[PDB]
């Protein structure tokens, strides 16, 4: 199975534009360079398909990639269902994802009129209407912001790379 194409991928998505790679016909394997390896519904089997979801967030937002969490990531960027069967894997990526002047390129959604439903993706760049006045693309705010990752920030504010495997109903 081409799990290598997902874990060892040179470029990762912004969490708001999280990347999904469909895995179909092949076999899985085993995985000390990961700070988080948490499975839900199974434990370290065969399945119809495997989905590999991958993106970058802050270290202290990794708690939010789990069933029934809240926060700007779980609510407005990447939502897991309460009944989720799959594994959540993260690791510190300060070496690849932080830059001297601040890395702008990794963005998150800060504002949204309601919560995402589980596994929903929203790539919208449309101005968020907070107040009564409709917004002429200028109480009118841009909904995406940058993490600006810097190599010197504390572990909590460093970029972590996350891979979510979903198993729907490939053999281990």
């Amino acid at each position, epitope marked *: 199975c081409p799990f290598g194409e997902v874990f060892n991928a040179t470029r990762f998505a912004s969490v708001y534009a999280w990347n999904r790679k469909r895995i179909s016909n092949c076999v899985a394997d085993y995985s000390a360079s990961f700070s988080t390896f948490k499975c839900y519904g199974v434990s370290p089997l065969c399945f119809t398909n495997v989905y590999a979801d991958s993106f970058v967030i802050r270290g202290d937002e990794v708690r939010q990639i789990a069933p029934g969490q809240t926060g700007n990531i779980a609510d407005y960027n990447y939502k897991l269902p309460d009944d989720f069967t799959g594994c959540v894997i993260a690791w510190n990526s*300060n070496n690849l994802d932080s830059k*001297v002047g601040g890395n702008y390129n990794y963005l998150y959604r800060l504002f949204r009129k309601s919560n995402l439903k589980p596994f929903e993706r929203d790539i919208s760049t449309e101005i968020y209407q907070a107040g009564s006045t409709p917004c002429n693309g200028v109480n009118c705010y841009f909904p995406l912001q940058s993490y600006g990752f810097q*190599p010197t920030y504390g572990v909590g504010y460093q970029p972590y790379r996350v891979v979510v495997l979903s198993f729907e109903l490939v053999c281990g």
Partner: antibody
Amino acid sequence: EVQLVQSGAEVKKPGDSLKISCKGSGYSFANYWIGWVRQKPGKGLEWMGIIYPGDSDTRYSPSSLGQVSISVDKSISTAYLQWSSLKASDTAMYYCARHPIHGYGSGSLYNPDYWGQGTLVTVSS
Amino acid sequence: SVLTQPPSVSAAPGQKVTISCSGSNSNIGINYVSWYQQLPETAPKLLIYENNQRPSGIPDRFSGSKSGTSATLGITGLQTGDEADYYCGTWDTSLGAYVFGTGTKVTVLG
């Protein structure tokens, strides 16, 4: 075989603009970070920075940020290092080097593997 | 932030030399160390990667190790062709930059 073929020797005066070239063959140019190292006559290697050909994302060293600018033309598999105003102190050999990602998860780092033959830049008034 | 190497080492053909590379917890302490060989008037060449791995074509006379914040290159059965500048390197996590050591001149004593 991976090959990194660099532009020819450059003779310039202070205040001149200069763009040097490095073309990658024998691999998918687009999928690999590539960057620049400086060696002044009889001195150590000085890492300057790297670029991801796909989307021109960059990493500069403290010393090299703002001084110099790295760019790419993904279609001709070519990486570029560019000054708008050369100083005499920019006289050096400049090597391009491919930076595959070595290691795995938290041990992942950008890492020089293959080097070009070098480009001598001689800046005298 | 500097990876410090001895400026120069020498020995007779057939002897062993070691080249130390001392850094900090932001560089050698956390990250994979590489070594680069630069023969007079040539481009550097990767000699060692991931602390102790040899690229295809690099003889097992060349060995690498890392312990704490210092790495070491050993060259056994020193040969004329080994006379070169050697540089360690790694990524400095705190700097967000690759760093090369100060470099060592190996002399094969004739």
